């Protein structure tokens, strides 16, 4: 009765996730592994393979290249932000919250969920790009100049640990609903109807991992730790911004690399 209602909440969340996010983890993994119909992604692993890429213009200046990448990738994230907002309205009790608190919770949670979406696109060797038609290597990203080599390596590091948990789309829905309903965000008017939906969401999650991963070991706690890791990736972005502002120049970067980085986050 209590546990039946937990399972039903889990189900409702998963159908509503399926409906809000066309790019599921299962579809990204099919692309990556090779279950795919359509031709495999093109691999970019060096400058020669970069330039043999015409599957995707004007003249950015050294001390703006990075900022313009960051702006570029955030503006390209709007579709993702709208899908997460769509999903969020489906979480029971959400739209019942004070409109101001709905916006607040999305404004913070959206960054963390985006990194969860990125981990789907990653494996230990690299990341899908250009709507899943290309694949950029981890080693090549890391090789690049100046401050750019350290943009993505810490995101890879997280994704590899997060992807080792082997969550599927039905676990991810609940996990994502939990992130959104975080009682601690800055400026929340009423931090308690929020904490109460979350607690209910934690129970369903706890049950979901028992049913779905009956072999596993502290999966629930390991997954709750990742919420902390997600916040740190977001806050680490502020430090990175400082590093750009006073680097030993130059920060030119081939256009096509700029284009590639705007598909990341």
């Amino acid at each position: 009765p209590e546990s039946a209602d937990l399972r039903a909440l889990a189900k409702h969340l998963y159908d509503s996730y399926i409906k809000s996010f066309p790019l599921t983890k299962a579809k990204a993994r099919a692309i990556l592994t090779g279950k795919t119909t359509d031709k495999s992604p093109f691999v970019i692993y060096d400058m020669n393979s970069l330039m043999m890429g015409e599957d995707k213009p004007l003249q950015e200046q050294s001390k703006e290249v990075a900022i313009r990448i960051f702006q570029g990738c955030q503006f390209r994230s709007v579709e993702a932000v709208q899908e997460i907002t769509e999903y969020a309205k489906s979480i029971p009790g959400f739209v019942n919250l004070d409109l101001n608190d709905q916006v607040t919770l999305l404004k913070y949670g959206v960054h963390e969920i985006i990194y969860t979406m990125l981990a789907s696109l990653m494996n230990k060797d690299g990341v899908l790009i250009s709507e899943g038609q290309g694949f950029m290597t981890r080693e090549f990203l890391k090789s690049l100049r100046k401050p750019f080599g350290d943009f993505m390596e810490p995101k890879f590091e997280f994704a590899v640990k997060f992807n080792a948990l082997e969550l599927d789309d039905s676990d991810l829905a609940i996990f994502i609903a939990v992130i959104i309903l975080s009682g601690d965000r800055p400026g929340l008017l009423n931090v308690k109807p929020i904490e109460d939906i979350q607690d209910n969401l934690l129970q369903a999650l706890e049950l979901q991992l028992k049913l779905n991963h009956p072999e596993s070991s502290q999966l629930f706690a390991k997954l709750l730790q990742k919420m902390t890791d997600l916040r740190q990736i977001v806050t680490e972005h502020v430090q990175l911004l400082q590093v750009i502002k006073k680097t030993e120049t130059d920060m030119s970067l081939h256009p096509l690399l700029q284009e590639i980085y705007k598909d990341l986050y």
Binding site: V78, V81, Q82, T85, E86, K89, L99, Q102, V103, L106, K107, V110
Partner: peptide, 13 residues
């Protein structure tokens, strides 16, 4: 100029 909140607010409505 309209930021992240605005796109969130427009999608909620």
């Amino acid at each position: 100029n309209l930021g992240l909140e605005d796109i969130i607010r427009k999608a909620l409505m």
